[PDB]
Amino acid sequence: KGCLLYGPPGTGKTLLARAVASQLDCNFLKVVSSSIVDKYIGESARLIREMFNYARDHQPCIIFMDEIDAIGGRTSADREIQRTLMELLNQMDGFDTLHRVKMIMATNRPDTLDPALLRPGRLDRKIHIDLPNEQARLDILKIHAGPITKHGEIDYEAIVKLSDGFNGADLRNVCTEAGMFAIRADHDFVVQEDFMKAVRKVADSKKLESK
Amino acid sequence: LDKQIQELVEAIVLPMNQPPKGVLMYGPPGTGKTLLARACAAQTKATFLKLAGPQLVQMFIGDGAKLVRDAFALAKEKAPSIIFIDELAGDREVQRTMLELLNQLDGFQPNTQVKVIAATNRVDILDPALLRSGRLDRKIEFPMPNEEARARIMQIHSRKMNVSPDVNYEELARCTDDFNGAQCKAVCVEAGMIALRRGATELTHEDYMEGILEVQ
Amino acid sequence: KEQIEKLREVVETPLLHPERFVNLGIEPPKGVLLFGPPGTGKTLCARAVANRTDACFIRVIGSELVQKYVGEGARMVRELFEMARTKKACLIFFDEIDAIGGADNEVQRTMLELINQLDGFDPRGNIKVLMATNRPDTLDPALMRPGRLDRKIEFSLPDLEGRTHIFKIHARSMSVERDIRFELLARLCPNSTGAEIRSVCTEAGMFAIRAR
Secondary structure, three states, X not given: OOEEEEOOOOOOHHHHHHHHHHHOOOOEEEOOOOOOOOOOOOOHHHHHHHHHHHHHHOOOOEEEEOOOOOOOOOOHHHHHHHHHHHHHHHHHOOOOOOOOOEEEEEEOOOOOOOOOOOOOOOOOEEEEOOOOOXXXXXXXXXXXXXXXXXXXXXXXXXXXXXXXOOOHHHHHHHHHHHHXXXXXXXXXXXXXXXXXXXXXXXXXXXXXXXX | OHHHHHHHHHHHHOOOOOOOOEEEXXXXXOOOHHHHHHHHHOOOOOOEEEOOOOOOXXXXXXXXXXXXXXHHHHHHHOOXXXXXXXXXXXXXXXXXXXXXXXXXXXXXOOOOOOOXXXXXXXXXXXXXXXXXXXXXXXXXXXXXXXHHHHHHHHHHOOXXXXXXXXXXXXXXXXXXXXXXHHHHHHHHHHHHHHHXXXXXXXXXXXHHHHHHHHHO | OHHHHHHHOOOOHHHHOHHHHHOOOOOOOOEEEEOOOOOOOOHHHHHHHHOOOOOOOEEEEHHHOOOOXXXXXXXXHHXXXXXXXXXXXXXXXXXXXXXOOOOOHHHHXXXXXXXXXXXXXXXXXXXXEEEEOOOOOOHHHXXXXXXXXXXXXXXXXXXXXXXXXXXXXXXXXOOOOOOOOOHHHHOOOXXXXXXXXXXXXXXXXXXXXXXX
């Protein structure tokens, strides 16, 4: 009922975690990192029981928890955070059969991850997101290039080599970006010229605006 | 102004035949981006549906997500249309609907349809969380080439405003430092406002620089 | 002499010669802005009512916008704008805008719908704009003003040779000493704002009262 997706080697933790997440998910319940500060009276407990009470009304659901390092402290800023952590303990470890519920946790560094929360059961399976390998980029390109139409001439070395620091979701939206770029002229076939041009230009736009 | 609106028109004609989601066509007030995005939106042949900035914030709470999800319901169900918005706590809910929007456009990919054509009249304040391909990516400032373009769009936008035939455009084109053509349009507005008390029914040459030194 | 023409050329000229403004170039002007101390406020507007050519118009004060049982103010501004529609672009005067300006959602309906009707071109957007208020601390009209309104000037302060007109309209006091000379009161007190002269009638007139 939990998973950990950390990206210590560098950027790509949210891009690959949101690439597999973008591949498979469930009902939408996002936890924004701005709804826990609670500048007013610290009544976030009834908000956790309310939102997770809706997660009790709806049986299938996946709860995204991205950027947990800022709320993963092992002042009053961290006391409300630890209060929400106690509400999590009494929330999933309470007297309820919350087995169908699912959640996904993401972070930056596996050092301040609340080793009390690092207990088994709390996070069953963890995947160490490493740097994008060229073989996983050629494979992810061959599995993300299937349903999209292409021309008879195939040269994947230019798309693998010209794409660096990208993940399944990045190369997905860039290759489909080039597919739409080539379908602009409503041609049924897609020559790899628009692949190289749109992958190069849009890939440069992602390298410049990748913050 | 074709170098910045061409990408918009192409980006909004290509899905009917992913297209960019956020393009920032900005400039000083009175630029004419609404009458040119409408003069070209009429040429796009799609349904021209109007939407404004302050329409999201209403008397009741939670209306911004109501108009965003409602405009994305009529736009999601209807054919690709043309929505041009201008003049882009409550802002925390706007960031929740924004991160949810790009969570449905980044975690999901159903948006092969209409986009959010946003335009601001001033870029003095800019959220650092507005930098992505789906976010405001194409940030094109006022055209760097010479005055000719400013006289062309300013003359088309000022077809009813005559000009005395003694103008080199080099003095007014050179004196404008860190300025844009919309501010010169406001200079023409003020100069035409004082043209009544000037006594001359025709806008003279010195009234341009008099307006530049007047309002700016 | 200067400011009275800067506000007269927008109240008398746009109706006497409409073609002169259509052919004059940019467009017919909108109006002026009168903000500052009251002084002789509402007197020059009554003079503009006395200078009416064909049909006297209806005045609207700022106190009518705020009333009990909210919801009637919208129908009131829409019914007076509808009267402006029926009376072939009738004149609409707004007095004491500070009572609602400077933003209470029940007031936000009337003032934000008021902005939605002024800046909105549905009834008409070019007949006559004119605002007479007291304090310039109205932030919302100061930021939404350059949309349609323009020509911001002082309230009454004239040039050195312009005071004699506001003293010829301020000649309606009790008396100076006798009926010998008006100019004795009109030119023997220069360098005095259009409200500082109301302090000259109130305080110098109070000195003429307290002089046994």
